[PDB]
Amino acid sequence: LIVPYNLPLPGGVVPRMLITILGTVKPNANRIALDFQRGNDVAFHFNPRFNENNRRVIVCNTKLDNNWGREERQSVFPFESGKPFKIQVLVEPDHFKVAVNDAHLLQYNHRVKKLNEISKLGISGDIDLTSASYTMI
Numbered sequence: 001l002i003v004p005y006n007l008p009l010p011g012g013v014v015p016r017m018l019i020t021i022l023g024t025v026k027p028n029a030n031r032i033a034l035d036f037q038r039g040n041d042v043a044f045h046f047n048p049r050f051n052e053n054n055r056r057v058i059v060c061n062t063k064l065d066n067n068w069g070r071e072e073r074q075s076v077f078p079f080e081s082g083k084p085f086k087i088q089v090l091v092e093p094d095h096f097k098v099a100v101n102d103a104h105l106l107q108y109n110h111r112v113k114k115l116n117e118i119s120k121l122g123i124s125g126d127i128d129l130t131s132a133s134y135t136m137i
């Protein structure tokens with residue numbers, strides 16, 4: 001698939017929706033981003049950074065009216081330059097739950113509460129994208 005890729009989420013997200021993203025990280029990757037969008041707002045930004053001051057970190061945040069909020073940072077970093085990955089995002093009633101390569105990574109409490117209005121997922125960054133899909137579990 002071509003990156004950046006936009007995956008419509010018809011009628012928005014709902015609990016029990018599972019989004020699965022398969023791809024490969026490019027060699028010498030700098031960043032990956034998943035952006036769950038509510039119009040111009042970003043309800044959930046998931047941003048692995050491969051070199052922030054010589055550290056690897058995942059930054060999560062929300063953008064409202066063009067302003068970024070308080071960052072949530074995770075130092076557990078399961079991505080590897082050059083290697084295939086699987087990201088799964090499970091929507092639960094009170095948070096997005098993220099697993100990478102079948103291991104739980106993090107949860108992100110819902111800041112944007114109109115879940116039905118979060119109707120697009122943007123996938124961008126230094127990856128080759130193989131598949132992006134959703135199902136109900």
Ligand SMILES: CO[C@@H]1O[C@H](CO)[C@H](O)[C@H](NC(=O)c2ccc(C)cc2)[C@@H]1OC(=O)c1ccc(C)cc1
Pocket residue numbers: 030031032033045047049050051059060061068069071124125
């Ligand atoms: C305070 O910096 C911001 O933090 C926000 C989260 O709080 C977003 O991540 C913004 N990123 C973005 O808008 C953004 C755009 C495109 C992609 C692919 C990812 C993130 C932006 O990050 C950056 O400017 C930035 C610069 C270099 C690296 C390596 C990572 C982040």
Ligand SMILES: [Cl-]
Pocket residue numbers: 111112113114
């Ligand atoms: Cl809201």
